Amino acid sequence: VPISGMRKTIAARLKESVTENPHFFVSTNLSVSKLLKLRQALNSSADGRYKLSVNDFLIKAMGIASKRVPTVNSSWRDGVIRQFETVDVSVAVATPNGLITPIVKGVEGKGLESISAAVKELAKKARDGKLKPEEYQGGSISISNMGMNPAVQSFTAIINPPQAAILAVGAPQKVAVPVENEDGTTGVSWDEQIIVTASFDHKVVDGAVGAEWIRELKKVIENPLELLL
Amino acid sequence: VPISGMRKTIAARLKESVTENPHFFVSTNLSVSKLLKLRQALNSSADGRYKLSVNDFLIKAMGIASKRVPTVNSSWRDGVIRQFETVDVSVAVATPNGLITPIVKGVEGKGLESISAAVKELAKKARDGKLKPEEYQGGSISISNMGMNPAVQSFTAIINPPQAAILAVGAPQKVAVPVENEDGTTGVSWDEQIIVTASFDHKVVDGAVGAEWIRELKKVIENPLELLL
Amino acid sequence: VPISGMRKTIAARLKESVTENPHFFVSTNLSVSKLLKLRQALNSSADGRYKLSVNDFLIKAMGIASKRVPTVNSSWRDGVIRQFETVDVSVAVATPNGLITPIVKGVEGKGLESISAAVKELAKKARDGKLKPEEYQGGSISISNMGMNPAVQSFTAIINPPQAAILAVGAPQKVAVPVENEDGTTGVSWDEQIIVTASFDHKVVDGAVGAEWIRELKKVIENPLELLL
Amino acid sequence: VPISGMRKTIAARLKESVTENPHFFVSTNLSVSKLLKLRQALNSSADGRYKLSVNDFLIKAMGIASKRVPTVNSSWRDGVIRQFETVDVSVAVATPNGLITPIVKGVEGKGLESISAAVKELAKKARDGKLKPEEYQGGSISISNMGMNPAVQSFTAIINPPQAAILAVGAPQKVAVPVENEDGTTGVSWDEQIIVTASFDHKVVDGAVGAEWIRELKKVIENPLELLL
């Protein structure tokens, strides 16, 4: 079968990414037992005006982490580092045509409802093939999601240039966790975990900086109430 | 110590692989408690006519998944995608001379006993150094195994070109899993888990396609009776 | 009523068969209590993608037995024995026009789902009268089924030339079987049996060979897990 | 594969048999629970001087039945019926070369030990290929045995000409049988049965005659003590 030609550009782009920018990976585990309760409560206290998912919370947390650590929200240009202020998030969508990356603008201080609405709009518009180039050309940070497929415990991705980082969220799973009952003995409790994998560019970011970013993300998620901050 | 010269070719090949094809990894966890029982029962209901292993089941499942999702069983050629129909599986063997990749032909609809016989034959012939080039030059998909070494929980490998994907199977381990007793309380059950890592080329395959392939593999393994299908 | 003319050809064919080839019969009893459980479980673990019967398992077992004993998969030609390698299976279908024998190709190493799909397609095409001559001219081995009729315990058939053997599968029935309880006393267990009748041509096959073939068939059925092998 | 030529003669012989002689079959069920006890006791009350089987008892019973009903021990010749007085028994042996029928002479009034010795000698001489034509050319009645194969419940055979009848003995099996305990209630007893199939030529013998022969056989077996008579 001959190549469609469109895949050629994507292959060249990815080749540029891997050959220009080295890649190192960080892998952590989050706890979402409180996040799911929060999502359920907000969904129930509603009149069909909105519907939430895990990706939106993750996007808000990404924005907060980027603002607390601006070095990640950066890039690599001609002998100069370009540093933004806001957070432009590229969300991946898997069409039968292939892959596409619409963008959400001004995440930090936008609202989860607006986020979900914009993501639904862009996803349906990509399934229809009705996008503009500016809506998927740009962005400082990216994300790919596979939570629907329960088999994937974890996976890596490739950094869509000229960006510096990219995230990946596996499926949820059941894990054993210790717990202290009212007496001195320990007990078993079942916590819902997710694995998260972040690939970074080493020219800009160091292992310590990436670890700090991941720590802030884990903290914000495990304490969802700090999303207000 | 000067270089043997043979290692030069493998180095150049791996360099071509990583520089021509970008790599992204997927990591999942399988449950094999039923698979091991099946292997035990089939080994018992025999008269020394055969002996099975986990790799053979894995190879059969790879064939089934490749047939259900043919995009993986592909390659990258001069401005064209070559898509096969059958599944040619490259199995790795670690000789004192290094690494070698014999091939099994027409896996789908071949039989586990024939598979085991062919694998044993090729492995002993590789230990003796009695192979032909056609036997290890080709193949659409590959695999490497390290189950004998119990310490390796997981590992990655490199795509032997011109193929598109490669698999890797860690060791088995003991993991906690919830279970519902006959009453309403949950309990602790010890299941035998294996980590599996799949490296894909991003020019041909996308994340959704890889996830679908892994899902089918997990389903087939967890329900071994579907191997008949 | 004058004769349709089509029956003339079938009469001459059967006359040639009985006058050229002597017939001897072998009658055995199988146990399918495990087979039916397997079929029920595979049907339950599905999404309507397929639906299985007993004839398909029987056909797979026929292929396995033919491969373990290739002398059965034979014929008689002009001063020469033609021996095949693959198993082409002629399945009988009872149309209002009469009897017809479509063929399934390459049974050994094909898969039960594909077998069922091909059989359904051929059966509907025969009910419609839309077949080619090649699809029902050939085959090394044949079979006739009457399982829908619960009255028939056993029955013989006639060897469709130039083949050497043919099968016949009666209905299931309830039979008494001894069983040892946990104590030393025996008990009564109700097993679901089927009678099977195989007609052979004596020029090619002998009683010992037919008995060996039937033993392998009984073994593979009573241990359905060996269908993988 | 071209034909060995030896099979040509056997094919022509069997063709002559089926085209000259019509075949009808009679199928019955025996009870051997006492016979096996008798065999075990006679084997235990010995010094390794002999070793018995079931076929020898069967051959003695065949001789007794043939003498009680001489019409079976007959043939068909040129406008004349040739009737013998003694019973010459053709026993089948399955060599890798094919099938062969050595003969035992003067069965009636010979003794089971002598019968077993002669059968062992003839069987080993047939496995070695050291026979004379007279030793397997003749005989008034024939038999084939498949008791070693537990899968075969019943089977037919073909009349070796110019004889008029032939026997066939399946495997033993477990069957449910009623039994009256000391009280008025019935109970379940497990008896060891064998199916027996006798093929007859219809020119000489009729259904009533065959039934009488089978009745006498069943009687002598079920009451083994009448073997003395």
DSSP labels, chain A: -B--SHHHHHHHHHHHHHHHS-EEEEEEEEE-HHHHHHHHHHHHSSSSS----HHHHHHHHHHHHHHHSTTTS---BTTB----SS--EEE-EEETTEEE--EE---TTS-HHHHHHHHHHHHHHHHHT---GGGGS--SEEEEE-TT-TTEEEE-----TT-SEEEEEEEEEEEEEEEE-SSSSEEEEEEEEEEEEEEEETTT--HHHHHHHHHHHHHHHHSGGGGG-
Q: Which residues of B touch A151 (CB under 8 A)?
A: 28, 211, 214-215, 217-219
Indicate the helix (H) or strand (E) that contains D215: helix D207-222
| Amino acid, res. D198 | A
Cα torsion angle, C73, D3, D164, D119, sign: negative
Task: List B99's β-bridge partners, or say none.
Answer: B94
Instruction: Give catalytic status of residue B23 as yes or no.
Output: no
What is the distance between the alpha carbons of residues B69 and B90, in angstroms, rounded to a whole number?
A: 18
Cβ of residue C151 closer than 8 Å to a chain B Cβ: no
Residue C15 CB contacts under 8 Å (≥ 6 apart), including other chains: none
What is the distance between the alpha carbons of residues B29 and A193, in angstroms, rounded to a whole number?
A: 14
Strand C23-31, strand B23-31: pairing: unpaired
DSSP secondary structure code for residue D225 in this structure: G
Nearest to C164 by CA among C80, C87, C75: C75
Task: List D190's β-bridge partners, or say none.
Answer: D176
Q: Which residues of C touch D98 (CB under 8 A)?
A: 206
Residue C125 CB contacts under 8 Å (≥ 6 apart), including other chains: C102, C131
Q: Rg of the Cα trace of chain A? A: 19
Q: Which residues of D touch C82 (CB under 8 A)?
A: 1
Cα torsion angle, D88, D94, D95, D99, sign: positive
DSSP secondary structure code for residue D80 in this structure: B
Owner of token pair 């970074």: A200
**Environment class of residue A38 by beta-carbon count within 10 Å: exposed (0-12), middle (13-18) or buried (19+)?**
middle
- To the nearest 10°, report the CA torsion of B19, B24, B29, B30: -70
Instruction: Give catalytic status of residue B202 as yes or no.
Output: yes
Here the tokens at position B221 are 């393994």
What is the distance between the alpha carbons of residues D72 and D208, in angstroms, rounded to a whole number?
A: 12
Cβ–Cβ under 8 Å, residues A84 and A67: no
Here the tokens at position C74 are 């034979």
In terms of C-beta distances under 8 Å and separation of at least 24 residues, what long-range contacts does C56-60 make, across chains too?
C56/C112, C56/C115, C56/C116, C56/C119, C57/C112, C57/C221, C57/C224, C57/C227, C58/C143, C58/C167, C58/C169, C58/C221, C59/C89, C59/C91, C59/C104, C59/C107, C59/C115, C59/C143, C60/C107, C60/C108, C60/C112, C60/C115, C60/C227
Omega of the bond leading into A162 within 30 degrees of 0 (cis): yes
Cα torsion angle, D32, D38, D39, D44, sign: positive
What is the distance between the alpha carbons of residues D107 and D105, in angstroms, rounded to a whole number?
A: 6
What is the distance between the alpha carbons of residues B143 and B74, in angstroms, rounded to a whole number?
A: 15
What is the distance between the alpha carbons of residues D127 and D95, in angstroms, rounded to a whole number?
A: 6
Omega of the bond leading into B162 within 30 degrees of 0 (cis): yes
Here the tokens at position D144 are 């084939």
Interface of A with B in 118-147 (CB under 8 A): 144, 146
Indicate the helix (H) or strand (E) that contains C192: strand C186-201
Quick check: do A and B touch, 3+ CB pairs under 8 A? yes
CA atoms within 13 A on the CB side of A160: 23
Owner of token pair 């929980």: B153
Cα torsion angle, B151, B153, B158, B159, sign: positive
What is the distance between the alpha carbons of residues B32 and B48, in angstroms, rounded to a whole number?
A: 24
Q: How many residues does chain C have?
A: 229
Nearest CA in chain A to B212: A149
Cβ–Cβ under 8 Å, residues D14 and C22: yes
How would you classify residue B219: left for phi > 0, otherwise alpha for psi between -120 and 50, otherwise beta? alpha
| Amino acid, res. A71 | T
Here the tokens at position D23 are 């075949």
Our CA-based measurement puts residue B107 at a distance from the nearest CA of chain C, in whole angstroms, of 9
For chain D, what is the largest distance between any 2 Cα atoms, rounded to a whole number of angstroms? 69
Which is the catalytic residue, given B23, B88, B128, B206? B206
Q: What angle do CA D67, D68, D74 make, to 5 degrees?
A: 55
Here the tokens at position A1 are 């079968």
Give the method of determination.
cryo-EM
Here the tokens at position A60 are 């808000």
b vs e for C4-26, b when ≥16 Cβ sit within 10 Å of the residue's Cβ?
A: eeeeeeeeeeeeebeebbbbbbb
b vs e for D186-204, b when ≥16 Cβ sit within 10 Å of the residue's Cβ?
A: eeeebebbbbbbbbbbeeb
Alpha carbon distances (Å) from D175 to A42, C83, C177, D30, D68: 69, 40, 7, 11, 30
Cβ–Cβ under 8 Å, residues A201 and A12: no
Cβ–Cβ under 8 Å, residues B41 and B204: no
- To the nearest 10°, report the CA torsion of D185, D189, D191, D195: 60
Cβ of residue A156 closer than 8 Å to a chain B Cβ: yes
| Amino acid, res. D98 | G
What is the distance between the alpha carbons of residues D123 and A58, in angstroms, rounded to a whole number?
A: 84
Owner of token pair 């899968």: D151
Here the tokens at position A73 are 């929200």
3-state SS track over chain B = CCCCCHHHHHHHHHHHHHHHCCEEEEEEEEECHHHHHHHHHHHHCCCCCCCCCHHHHHHHHHHHHHHHCCCCCECCECCECCECCCCCEEECEEECCEEECCEECCCCCCCHHHHHHHHHHHHHHHHHCCCCHHHHCCCCEEEEECCCCCCCCCCCCCCCCCCCEEEEEEEEEEEEEEEECCCCCEEEEEEEEEEEEEEEECCCCCHHHHHHHHHHHHHHHHCHHHHHC
Quick check: do C and D touch, 3+ CB pairs under 8 A? yes
Residue D17 CB contacts under 8 Å (≥ 6 apart), including other chains: C22, D158, D159, D160, D161
What is the distance between the alpha carbons of residues B66 and B84, in angstroms, rounded to a whole number?
A: 10
Our CA-based measurement puts residue D210 at a distance from the nearest CA of chain C, in whole angstroms, of 19
Cβ–Cβ under 8 Å, residues C229 and B50: yes
Query: CB count, 10 Å around CB of D176?
Result: 15
Give the N- to C-terminal CA distance of chain A in Å, as an integer. 53
- To the nearest 10°, report the CA torsion of C106, C111, C112, C114: -70
Cβ–Cβ under 8 Å, residues C77 and C162: yes
Contact yes or no for C208 and D1 at CB 8 A: no
Residue of A4, A8, A13, A156 to mutate, interface with B, max B Cβ within 10 Å: A156
- To the nearest 10°, report the CA torsion of B152, B156, B158, B160: 70
